[PDB]
């Protein structure tokens, strides 16, 4: 049936998947709308699927490593079903990219440069990391996958590359690291016993606590700057800070949810900004 | 099965005839060569040498001299042939070259050869090593060259030059490992059986030289995609 495999399609998702895949694309289209003044419904869905596919295909690379020790829904899983699904997802991504090229007005050399170089550039340096150093090599993927999704989404809409869409996507890049780090924190003893190495294990219990707070409270300082100096509309993400204090006190469902609220208010901040009130637009 | 046999044949062929192939290679390179912003370079040259030293200090752990001596001799000739080609297609480019040089695959094939027990067995070990490390390296050298190669069509001048050095690095790096290196590693061990890496390596080798399938399948799709990007950008457009 379809449901028994719909329960298999959750295998390529992580708790930070929404924040890494879909929030950037939504921000990028908002930037494109705020900058140029015309937005396309079709290209938004294409970008949304093209990014998720490449994300999911990358998550299965990590999923395959969980057959090493026996770390691995309610069915008997074999290492063929992972390979078949990763291949399918990545092919879906490339087909979406081809349709985006045909519909949009972006030059093919640049679309390839971003899509194959940036989004799909992860696959080049993973495969050799091993099941121990996955979580450690994942910080590097999340730092770069966030801003490039925003640029990819922006470029496909407008028709040329820019530089500011990377700068606007720092808060969303940090908020995702907060989720990954908070997830790595609670699995410290298990990963240490199994022989796995993460950042939270390397730095220790208290430096993890300092890093978590840094990653949590930087976005609010960036929005505090942008609010008062650039546009009063962009203070809307600061309505979540009582939740951030509660999270700092209780120390990742709550963190993952905070990111969703922050991302939503950030996009609604960019849309509601006055004309020519934001830098470089 | 079909490719492994082919790379086996190549490995054995090169391993059997060292002196002729190395002369031919060097002669070809002689016939090629003799025929006719600071901050960015600083940070790149600071990180590159650290990466090289990390890899050397990783190799240091094995506790043998010949592996270092062989890994050293691969680097020199790869750096030399790159210098030939980069001169022919034109000091400052080495920071990007030393990032793309692959000493792990150079060390691996040497470790296969060092686990031998007799002068006849060394060649067969090189062939067996070549069969495992041939396809895996060819696919990486294909993908990385196409991926860096897409940046040479972008428009930005710094990027168009930085990517060109990368392409010519990867190709010149691959060609050496395929032609010159197996003969060299054969000849060094030929002219010299005091190489103990059997009991440790003979278990881990056939498990280690296996990448992730989910990566290796995606690389073929990426390869097949980039070929269309290139083919469409050059001829049709």
């Amino acid at each position: 049936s379809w449901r028994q495999k719909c329960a298999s399609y959750v295998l390529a998702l992580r708790p930070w998947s929404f924040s890494a895949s879909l929030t950037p694309v939504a921000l990028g289209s908002a930037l494109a709308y705020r900058s140029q003044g015309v937005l396309d419904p079709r290209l938004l869905v294409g970008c949304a699927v093209a990014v998720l596919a490449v994300h999911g295909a990358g998550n299965l690379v990590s999923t395959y490593y969980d057959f090493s020790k026996g770390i691995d829904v309610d069915r008997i899983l074999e290492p063929q079903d992972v390979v078949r699904f990763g291949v399918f997802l990545y092919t879906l991504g490339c087909v979406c990219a081809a349709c985006l090229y045909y519909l949009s007005t972006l030059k093919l050399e640049h679309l390839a440069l971003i899509y194959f170089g940036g989004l799909s550039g992860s696959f080049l340096y993973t495969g050799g990391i091993g099941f121990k150093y996955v979580a450690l090599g994942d910080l590097i993927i999340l730092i770069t996958f966030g801003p490039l999704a925003v640029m990819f989404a922006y470029a496909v809409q407008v028709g040329s590359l820019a530089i500011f869409p990377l700068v606007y996507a720092i808060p969303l890049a940090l908020s995702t690291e907060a989720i990954l780090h908070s997830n790595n924190t609670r699995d410290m003893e298990s990963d240490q016993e199994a022989g796995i190495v993460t950042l939270a294990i390397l730095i220790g219990p208290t430096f993890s606590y300092v890093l978590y707070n840094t990653l949590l409270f930087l976005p609010y300082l960036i929005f505090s700057i942008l609010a008062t100096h650039c546009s009063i509309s962009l203070a809307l993400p600061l309505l979540t800070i009582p939740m951030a204090f509660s999270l700092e006190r209780q120390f990742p469902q709550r963190t993952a949810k905070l990111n969703l609220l922050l991302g939503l208010f950030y996009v609604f901040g960019i849309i509601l900004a006055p004309a020519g009130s934001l830098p470089r637009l | 099965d079909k490719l492994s046999r082919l790379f086996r044949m190549h490995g054995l062929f090169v391993a059997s005839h060292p002196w002729e192939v190395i002369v031919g290679t060097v002669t070809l390179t002689i016939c090629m060569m003799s025929m006719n912003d600071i901050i960015i370079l600083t940070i790149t040259r600071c990180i590159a040498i650290l990466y090289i030293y990390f890899q050397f200090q990783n190799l240091r752990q094995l506790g043998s001299r010949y592996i270092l001596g062989i890994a050293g001799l691969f680097t020199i000739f790869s750096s030399f042939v790159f210098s030939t080609v980069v001169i022919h297609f034109l000091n400052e480019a080495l920071p990007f070259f030393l990032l793309l040089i692959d000493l792990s695959r150079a060390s691996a094939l040497a470790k296969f050869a060092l686990s031998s027990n007799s002068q006849d067995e060394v060649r067969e070990n090189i062939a067996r090593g070549m069969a495992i490390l041939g396809p895996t390296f060819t696919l990486d050298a294909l993908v990385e060259c196409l991926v860096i190669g897409v940046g040479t069509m972008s428009g930005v001048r710094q990027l168009e030059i930085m990517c060109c050095f990368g392409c010519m690095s990867v190709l010149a790096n691959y060609f050496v490992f395929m032609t010159f290196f197996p003969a060299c590693v054969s000849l060094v061990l030929e002219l010299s059986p005091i190489w103990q890496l059997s009991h440790f390596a003979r278990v881990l080798e056939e498990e280690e030289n296996r990448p992730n399938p989910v990566t290796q399948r995606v690389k073929m799709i990426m390869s097949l995609g980039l070929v269309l990007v290139h083919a469409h950008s050059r001829w049709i457009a």
Partner: antibody
Amino acid sequence: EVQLQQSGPELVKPGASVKMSCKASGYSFTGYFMNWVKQSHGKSLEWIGRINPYNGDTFYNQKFKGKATLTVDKSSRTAHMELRSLTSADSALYFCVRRGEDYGSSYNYWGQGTTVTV
Amino acid sequence: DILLTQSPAILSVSPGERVSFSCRASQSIGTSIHWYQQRTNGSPRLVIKYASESISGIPSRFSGSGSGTDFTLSINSVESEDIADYYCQQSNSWPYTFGGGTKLEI
């Protein structure tokens, strides 16, 4: 049509070691796991372990951790199991068994039984 | 080790009448059970997977039921080809453990 051809009966002495081959033919050998089941006298099936043929990443049952070590031969499509330090209790049939073709299937393809005798 | 149990040890039947077994688990194992049929001098041959889903190639008389802890396999009309031993296996947690075995009789 997948079949898992298996080795013939083996007579041995106490303290020896034995090796059994399960020549898996009819599919992509490195795609699926290769499990092992022991049917002792009295008709009680017990799960020994599994092996990933691609890597060789084994994963045993805690009861059979010491005296059963699985290896693989990727060249000839053959999965092995080595029983060490045998006793009178280890006289049993041993099956090799892998999962169904598609997702959400249980163990359809079994071997034939290597009648080990101590 | 999720210990499984089974309740006639030897079941005496007649040809035509309905029969039922009972693979009652120790823990809650969801809907993960598998019923194998082993004849004389043969291998186990899968009949029902995950307690209800029939296998293509098996006669339609084999029908599984139940969930949670108690599971039941039932045959409606036994023939000469149903006289065998029936084991149940859980594939929920590792190691996978089989039942005891329920033998048929005329």
